[PDB]
PDB file of C-alpha atoms in Angstrom:
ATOM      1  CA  UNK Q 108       8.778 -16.551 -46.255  1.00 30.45           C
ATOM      2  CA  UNK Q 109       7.389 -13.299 -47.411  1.00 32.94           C
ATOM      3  CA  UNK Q 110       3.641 -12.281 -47.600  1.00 30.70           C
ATOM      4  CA  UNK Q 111       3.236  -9.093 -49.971  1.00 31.27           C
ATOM      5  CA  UNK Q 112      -0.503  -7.904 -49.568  1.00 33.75           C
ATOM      6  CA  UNK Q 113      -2.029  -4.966 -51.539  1.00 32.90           C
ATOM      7  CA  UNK Q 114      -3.506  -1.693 -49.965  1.00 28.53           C
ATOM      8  CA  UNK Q 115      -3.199  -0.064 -53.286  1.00 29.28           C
ATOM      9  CA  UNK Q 116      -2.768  -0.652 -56.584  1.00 28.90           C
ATOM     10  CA  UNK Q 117       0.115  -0.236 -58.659  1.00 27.79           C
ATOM     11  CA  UNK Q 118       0.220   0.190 -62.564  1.00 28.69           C
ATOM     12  CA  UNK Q 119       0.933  -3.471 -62.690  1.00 29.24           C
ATOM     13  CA  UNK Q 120       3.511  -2.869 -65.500  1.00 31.18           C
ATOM     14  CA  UNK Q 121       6.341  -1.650 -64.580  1.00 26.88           C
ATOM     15  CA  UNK Q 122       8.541  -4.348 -62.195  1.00 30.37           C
ATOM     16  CA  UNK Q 123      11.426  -3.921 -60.129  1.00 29.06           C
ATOM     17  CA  UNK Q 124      14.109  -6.029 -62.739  1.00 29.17           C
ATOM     18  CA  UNK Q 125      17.521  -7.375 -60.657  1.00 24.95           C
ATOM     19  CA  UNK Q 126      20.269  -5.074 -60.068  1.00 24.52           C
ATOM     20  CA  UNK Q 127      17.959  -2.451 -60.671  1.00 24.52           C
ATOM     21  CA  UNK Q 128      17.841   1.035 -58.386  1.00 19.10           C
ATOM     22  CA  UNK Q 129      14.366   1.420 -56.650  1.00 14.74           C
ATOM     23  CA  UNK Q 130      12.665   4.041 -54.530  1.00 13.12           C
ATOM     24  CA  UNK Q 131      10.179   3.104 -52.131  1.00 14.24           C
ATOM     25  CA  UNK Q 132       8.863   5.366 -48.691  1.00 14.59           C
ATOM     26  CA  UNK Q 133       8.210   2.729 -46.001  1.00 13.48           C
ATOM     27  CA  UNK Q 134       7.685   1.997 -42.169  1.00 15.19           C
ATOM     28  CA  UNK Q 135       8.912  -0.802 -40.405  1.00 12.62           C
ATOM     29  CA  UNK Q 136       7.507  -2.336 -36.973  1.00 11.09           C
ATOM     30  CA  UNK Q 137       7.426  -5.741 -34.794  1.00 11.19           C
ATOM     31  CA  UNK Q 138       4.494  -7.573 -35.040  1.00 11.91           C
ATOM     32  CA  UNK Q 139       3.198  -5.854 -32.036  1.00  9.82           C
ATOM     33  CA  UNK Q 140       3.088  -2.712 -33.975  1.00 11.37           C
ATOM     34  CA  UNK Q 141       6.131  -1.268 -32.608  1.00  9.18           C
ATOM     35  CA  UNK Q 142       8.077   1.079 -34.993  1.00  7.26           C
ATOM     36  CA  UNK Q 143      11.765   0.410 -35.596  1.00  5.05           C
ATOM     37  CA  UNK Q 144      12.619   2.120 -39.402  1.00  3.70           C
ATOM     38  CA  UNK Q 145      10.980   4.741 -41.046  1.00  5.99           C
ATOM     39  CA  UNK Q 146      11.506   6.606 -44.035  1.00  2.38           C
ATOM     40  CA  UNK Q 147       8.567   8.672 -44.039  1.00  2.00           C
ATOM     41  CA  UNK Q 148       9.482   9.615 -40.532  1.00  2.00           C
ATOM     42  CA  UNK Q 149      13.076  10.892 -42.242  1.00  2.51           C
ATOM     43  CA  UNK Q 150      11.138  12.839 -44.672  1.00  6.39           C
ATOM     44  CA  UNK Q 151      13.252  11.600 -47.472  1.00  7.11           C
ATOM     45  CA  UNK Q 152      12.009   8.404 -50.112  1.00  7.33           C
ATOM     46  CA  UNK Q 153      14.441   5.480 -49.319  1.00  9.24           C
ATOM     47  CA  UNK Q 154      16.862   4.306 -52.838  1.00 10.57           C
ATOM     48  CA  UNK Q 155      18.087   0.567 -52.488  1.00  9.74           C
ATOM     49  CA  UNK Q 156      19.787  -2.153 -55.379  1.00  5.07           C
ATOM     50  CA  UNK Q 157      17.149  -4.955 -55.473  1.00  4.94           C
ATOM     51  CA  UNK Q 158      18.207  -8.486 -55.587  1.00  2.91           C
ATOM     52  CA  UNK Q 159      22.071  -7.768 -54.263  1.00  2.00           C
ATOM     53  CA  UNK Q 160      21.229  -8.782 -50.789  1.00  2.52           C
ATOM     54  CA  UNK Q 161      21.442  -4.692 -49.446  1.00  2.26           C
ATOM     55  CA  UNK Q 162      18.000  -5.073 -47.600  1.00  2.00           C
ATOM     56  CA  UNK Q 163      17.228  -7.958 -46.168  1.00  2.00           C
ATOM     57  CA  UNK Q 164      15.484 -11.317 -48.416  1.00  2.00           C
ATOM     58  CA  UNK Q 165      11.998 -10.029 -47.637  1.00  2.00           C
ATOM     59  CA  UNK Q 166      12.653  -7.216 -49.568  1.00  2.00           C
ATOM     60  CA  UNK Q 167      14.176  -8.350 -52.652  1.00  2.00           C
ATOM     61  CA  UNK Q 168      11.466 -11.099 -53.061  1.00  2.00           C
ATOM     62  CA  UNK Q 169       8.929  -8.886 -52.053  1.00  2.00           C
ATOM     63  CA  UNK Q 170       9.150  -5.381 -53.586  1.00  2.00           C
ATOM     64  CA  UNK Q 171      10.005  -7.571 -56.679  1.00  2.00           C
ATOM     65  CA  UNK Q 172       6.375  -8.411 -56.717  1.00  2.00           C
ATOM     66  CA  UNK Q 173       5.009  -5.035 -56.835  1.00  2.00           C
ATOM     67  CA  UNK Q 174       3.980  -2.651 -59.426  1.00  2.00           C
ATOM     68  CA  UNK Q 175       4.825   1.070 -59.621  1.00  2.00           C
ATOM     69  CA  UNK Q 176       2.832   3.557 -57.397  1.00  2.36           C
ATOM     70  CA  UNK Q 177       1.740   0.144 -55.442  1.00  2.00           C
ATOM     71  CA  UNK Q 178       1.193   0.349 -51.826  1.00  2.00           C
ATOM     72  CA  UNK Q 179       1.542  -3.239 -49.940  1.00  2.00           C
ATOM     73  CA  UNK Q 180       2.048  -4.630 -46.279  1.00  2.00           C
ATOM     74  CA  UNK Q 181       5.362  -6.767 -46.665  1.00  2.00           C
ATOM     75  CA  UNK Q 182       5.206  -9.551 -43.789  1.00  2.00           C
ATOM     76  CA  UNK Q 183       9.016 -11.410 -43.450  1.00  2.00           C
ATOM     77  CA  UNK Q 184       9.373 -14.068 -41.637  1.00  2.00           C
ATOM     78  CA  UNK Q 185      12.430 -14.438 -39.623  1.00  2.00           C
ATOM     79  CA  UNK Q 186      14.017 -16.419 -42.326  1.00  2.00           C
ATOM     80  CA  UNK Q 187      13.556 -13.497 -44.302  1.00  2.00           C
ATOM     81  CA  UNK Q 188      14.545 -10.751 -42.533  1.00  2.00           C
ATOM     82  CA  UNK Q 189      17.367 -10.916 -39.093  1.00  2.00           C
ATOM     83  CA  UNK Q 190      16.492 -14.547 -38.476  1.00  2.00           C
ATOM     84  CA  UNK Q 191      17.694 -16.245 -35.087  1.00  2.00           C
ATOM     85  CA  UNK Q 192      20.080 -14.051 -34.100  1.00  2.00           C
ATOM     86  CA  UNK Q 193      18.172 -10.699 -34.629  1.00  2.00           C
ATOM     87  CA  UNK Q 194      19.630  -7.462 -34.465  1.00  2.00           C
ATOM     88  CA  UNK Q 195      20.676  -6.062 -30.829  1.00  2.00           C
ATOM     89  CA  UNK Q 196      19.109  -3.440 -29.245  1.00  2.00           C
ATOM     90  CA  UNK Q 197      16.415  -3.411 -32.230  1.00  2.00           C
ATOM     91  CA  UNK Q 198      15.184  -6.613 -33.839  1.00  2.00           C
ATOM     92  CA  UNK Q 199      14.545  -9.374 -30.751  1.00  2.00           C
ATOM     93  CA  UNK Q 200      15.535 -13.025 -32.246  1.00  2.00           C
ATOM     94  CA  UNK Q 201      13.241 -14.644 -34.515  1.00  2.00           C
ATOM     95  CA  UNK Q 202      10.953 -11.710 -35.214  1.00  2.00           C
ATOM     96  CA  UNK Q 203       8.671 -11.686 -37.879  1.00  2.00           C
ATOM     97  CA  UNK Q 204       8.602  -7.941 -39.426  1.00  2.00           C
ATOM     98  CA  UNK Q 205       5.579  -6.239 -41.167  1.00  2.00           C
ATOM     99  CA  UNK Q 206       6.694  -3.175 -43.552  1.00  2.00           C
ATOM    100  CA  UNK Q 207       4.228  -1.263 -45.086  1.00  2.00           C
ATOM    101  CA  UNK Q 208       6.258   0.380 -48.370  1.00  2.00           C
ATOM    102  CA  UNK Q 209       5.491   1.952 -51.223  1.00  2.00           C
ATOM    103  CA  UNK Q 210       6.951   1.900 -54.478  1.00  2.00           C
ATOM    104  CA  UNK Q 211       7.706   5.000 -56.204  1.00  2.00           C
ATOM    105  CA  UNK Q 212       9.181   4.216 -59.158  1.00  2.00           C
ATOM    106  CA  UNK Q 213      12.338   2.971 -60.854  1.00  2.00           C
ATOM    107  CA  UNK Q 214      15.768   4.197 -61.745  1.00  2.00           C
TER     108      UNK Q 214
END
């Protein structure tokens, strides 16, 4: 489903809860490295809902896993992420996904 491997540590403490806001900066490519999403490249830390299905599954099982100030490769599986179908013109079907995000902290 989702692989969540640490680069960096977080404070191991404080965890995303359901509903709640997070702030994470992050980079999305294709398994061949390609970029498609960035939020470092829009200069401006990225503010979701965890757990209400506004990012896709990889995401809300995955960033649930991490820690405050943790920095983690996040590797969805199509499944987890635009699945068969893909997303047109930016996500081929049944692409696996490797995010490298950071969580910031919790609001």
């Amino acid at each position: 489903g989702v692989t969540v491997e640490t680069i960096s540590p977080g404070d191991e403490s404080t965890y995303p809860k359901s509903g709640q806001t997070v702030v994470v900066h992050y980079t999305g490519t294709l398994t061949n490295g390609k970029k498609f999403d960035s939020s470092r490249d829009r200069g401006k830390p990225f503010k979701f809902r965890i757990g209400k299905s506004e990012v896709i599954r990889g995401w809300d099982e995955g960033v649930a896993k991490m820690s405050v100030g943790e920095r983690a490769k996040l590797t969805c599986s199509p499944d987890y992420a635009y699945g068969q179908q893909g997303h047109p013109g930016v996500i081929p079907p049944n692409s696996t996904l490797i995010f490298d995000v950071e969580l910031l902290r919790l609001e």
